[PDB]
Design a binder for this molecule. Structure first.
Ligand SMILES: [Ca+2]
Ligand SMILES: [Ca+2]
Ligand SMILES: [Ca+2]
Ligand SMILES: [Ca+2]
Ligand SMILES: [Zn+2]
Ligand SMILES: [Zn+2]
Ligand SMILES: [Zn+2]
Ligand SMILES: [Zn+2]
Lengths: 63, 47, 244, 231, 244, 47, 63, 231
DNA sequence: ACTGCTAGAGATTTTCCC
DNA sequence: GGGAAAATCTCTAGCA
DNA sequence: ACTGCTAGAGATTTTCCC
DNA sequence: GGGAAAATCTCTAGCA
């Protein structure tokens, strides 16, 4: 009843950025979403992005 | 303790030095002769 | 080599030579010549070669007035999606700006607006409208238009689309709304291969769904890891640190 | 991979769930689940808006209601003119995915200017929205003393209706309902584009449902098979 | 899918959608939608995202007039070294430009000058001076100031150095020549760690020495490789190809 | 045979199409209605 | 009497550029100098640069 | 590496060639060859310009001659004023590496403005250049009919003298001679900077001549050694 | 205490198709 | 494992 | 048939020093 | 083989 919701929140993609790199890093895996930070998993690397530096979408090319 | 030499509102001249109060990601808050100013980091040099 | 320091300062007071010239002419290490040129107030004339990054939260918008054919176009962008709202206003006044902003906040979930320091946006009228609608007002650094770079890029793109379909409309109002239609729904590409209209509903529906999903997750996982945010098999995220 | 397919086929013929439930429950691609729900015989509107004109204080307020969600857009217009109606309609079509508008056959709704605007934006015209009009008029009466003009009171009422009046089943506002409805319609359109892209392929003679990185899902004579393609 | 081509052209004639929108909406491959958007005259509004490269031969200079404190400064740069010649001229006329150019050609081996299309440089007076001195005149593309990017960068740097030492001089002529001194001899860094004054004599002495050395080499090696330019142990350069 | 859509002397509008006569490293020489023009390659698109 | 001159012309350094890369590639070895082209050896790679794309210096930090 | 060192030491004590010949002939670094020529006892000006004023047609032409090369710079000045002389001198010091100027002690050369300009530019003042003045005046007479003004004839004469009048030993013009002389002076200054940078190091007590990537060249008691360092 | 970006054109690299 | 197509990278104007 | 560049500031990578 | 210094890379304003 809980792992279904955890995999559902992991089905969301995050496009994030770093502090001085102006390019948009690719679609990561959303692990956790907070009010000020967003914990992602990009390239088997768990990062904590600020919320103001992330665009989270469920890509509707999931079909 | 830092010195900040900054560029200001539509002025080509560079003012300073000023006390650095806060350094952010893309802007700094400084104090040049009892004037709290917010300058971008492209228009400021911190020593 | 303090004789080199004395002659290098005495020469830099005249010629304002850089650190390479003083390090080559007076046998100085680069640290000392860099200190000599850094202690001069007249030689600090260049800033950091970087750029900041705008706030791309799902609730922040960016507003700006542009001018086309002698008329004023008030444009707002959703900076997380590129969704464009635009109107032709009869005057660049805080009354029309507050009307546009109240109408936009009634249309979409506007949490924050990021404008420049134009009188339109700095007025008391736009300040009562954002207080009533619950919008936070962020103002950029004055005469730094790059702090609102999303809305200026969208002003450029909107003027380009207006110029493409200007001969299909008899007034500029029709051409502005036709360009808003074309940008929001007839041009794709970006972070999902979407148009801006698909991308804003993806951003907002994702915000709602992830908020409700994390609210249902958080009320179940109540572990204290030596507060658990996310447990995996290789790492564990707590609060926010990633413990191995 | 075939295990989830047979579980979904049995679960659909015993329960008749749609393709979204079979794609969430059994980890299938949505083309496979839609072909499962389309193989059955028992199981054989987000773009429709409705426009009306409401008269308050002598002024005229044009009101468009999303009939699937109840989301509303209102504008105090200077006159009941086809120019103002076509301007409102081009604005609304630029803001939201408007496919059909339902009007009340007035002199301004059947104008040539509104017909030209619906031709340009691609809108089809058809000739309980009064409940939405009554709730908007009572919210305007609740909020009229907070505005100086009527044009800045109908926008306050549209804000209160779309984001501050929650109800229905899940207690969502009209804005959350319209973004969920439009997101569902975008998922439907993307699934239809995915089906139309592979509806001309034939696999050796069988259909092509899903071409994975290691597997190819075909349908030979109402039998979904997984085998590891001509157009 | 020619029905998709017909409806995509009929929709692009209204909305001017890009190739991604027509490829997503009408089931088109990217080549066909790119052909539809490339056959439209109204959609060609962007050029190549590149830059050219100026001619950095050892004999070509770049001239430009700038304005400072209401006075006209005629500046020339050696674009292979950054060596700056500059004068304050009483008027932006072809007579003063021809005098400056004849004086510069008498001072340094000027083979080519690359100016814009300013009337000063486009005149018949500067055209007789370059004919007498043997200078070739290259003119840039009009209203493309990047084609003379070396001299505009040196105008920026020269104005910065003038602003640094403006309070040491009572007239602008003295400040311009002081800045020319500081740029040519008191600021180092570049392709050799040189100043511009060291770099121009390195460029020109290298040109003379390599010309004489290749003239003495060429009159000895007279082999025909199936004309020998340079024989090595791994390759052989002929004329100009590098045969293994 | 190429089409060239170019940008001209201080004009924001884009003209064309024109015959491409010569393509260089950073500029093109084209012919738009019996007018030989030299445009930079940043201000021109060749199809 | 000739290889001395060949090594002398190989003691010169060339700073060259390519057609679309705006960065200045580092000090190569001057093999041959002509009126329109310059044959260099950069990173054991023999290139033919145009003369208008090369700055040839004898670096006087040869001491 | 020591082989070229002993060949250069024997060749210097039999022939007395300078450090440039010993650095070109035996592939030594120039610090080693200069220490070889400095160890001997038998073998124990590019910045000097000279300024004069020449009167033609009533106008005054200030003429600076590089006394090592014969390269010339002339300007028709409006008056024999210390302002005009200091302006010419600051121009000339900005164009070329001017270290010393030799004048003819006139009222304009001993002015306070020229003294301030020589103090700022770093020039020292000292109080067959008439051969250069005569050749310039005869080239002006050869070229006066090709110009309208005298100011644009002295620049034509400076062009003809500096780049179109070849002579001397190798048949070089004055421009090639001054760029070879200034390049030789820059090589001399870079060698002096390289010597001064390592003149404080001592290697264990011996000098440090050249610190290679695999070898260290020292001098212990007039004996250049190669061994594979404190300041 | 706040902050360049966006869309298109062409080149380069990666992935798919037998 | 080549060729073609798609995805990604690089870079620029123009909006202030 | 012609063409962005230059110098400085800070980050990152490579080389030297025992 | 770490630490420090030097060399190299990245990026920006401002000149048109
Ligand atoms: Ca503004
Ligand atoms: Ca100019
Ligand atoms: Ca603006
Ligand atoms: Ca200019
Ligand atoms: Zn200084
Ligand atoms: Zn069924
Ligand atoms: Zn088009
Ligand atoms: Zn001797």
């Amino acid at each position: 009843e809980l792992q279904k919701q955890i995999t559902k929140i992991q089905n969301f993609r995050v496009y994030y950025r770093d502090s001085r790199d102006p390019v948009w890093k690719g679609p990561a895996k959303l692990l956790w979403k907070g009010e000020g930070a967003v914990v992602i998993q990009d390239n088997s690397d768990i990062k904590v992005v600020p919320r103001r530096k992330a665009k989270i979408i469920r890509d509707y090319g999931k079909q | 303790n830092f010195r900040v030499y900054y560029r200001d509102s539509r002025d080509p001249v560079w003012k300073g030095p000023a006390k650095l109060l806060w350094k952010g990601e893309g802007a700094v808050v400084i104090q040049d002769n009892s004037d709290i100013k917010v300058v971008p980091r492209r228009k400021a040099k911190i020593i | 080599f303090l004789d080199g320091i004395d002659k290098a300062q005495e020469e830099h007071e005249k010629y304002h030579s850089n650190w390479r010239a003083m390090a080559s002419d007076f046998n100085l290490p680069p640290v000392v010549a860099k200190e000599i040129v850094a202690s001069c107030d007249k030689c600090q004339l260049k800033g950091e070669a970087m750029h900041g990054q705008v706030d791309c939260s799902p609730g922040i918008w960016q507003l700006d007035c542009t001018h086309l054919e002698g008329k004023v176009i008030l444009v707002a962008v959703h900076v997380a999606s590129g969704y464009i709202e635009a109107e032709v206003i009869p005057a660049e006044t805080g009354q029309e700006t507050a009307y546009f902003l109240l109408k936009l906040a009634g249309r979409w979930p506007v949490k924050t607006v990021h404008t420049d320091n134009g009188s339109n946006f700095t007025s008391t009228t736009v300040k009562a409208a954002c207080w009533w609608a619950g919008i936070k007002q962020e103002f950029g650094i004055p005469y730094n238009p790059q702090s609102q770079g999303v809305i200026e890029s969208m002003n450029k793109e909107l003027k380009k689309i207006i110029g493409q379909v200007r001969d299909q409309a008899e007034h500029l109002k029709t051409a502005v709304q036709m360009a808003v239609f074309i940008h929001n729904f007839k041009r794709k590409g970006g972070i999902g291969g979407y148009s801006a209209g698909e991308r804003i509903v993806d951003i907002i529906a994702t915000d709602i769904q992830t908020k409700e999903l994390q609210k249902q997750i958080t009320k179940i996982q109540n572990f204290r890891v030596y507060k658990l945010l996310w447990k995996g098999e290789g790492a564990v995220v707590i609060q926010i640190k990633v413990v191995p």
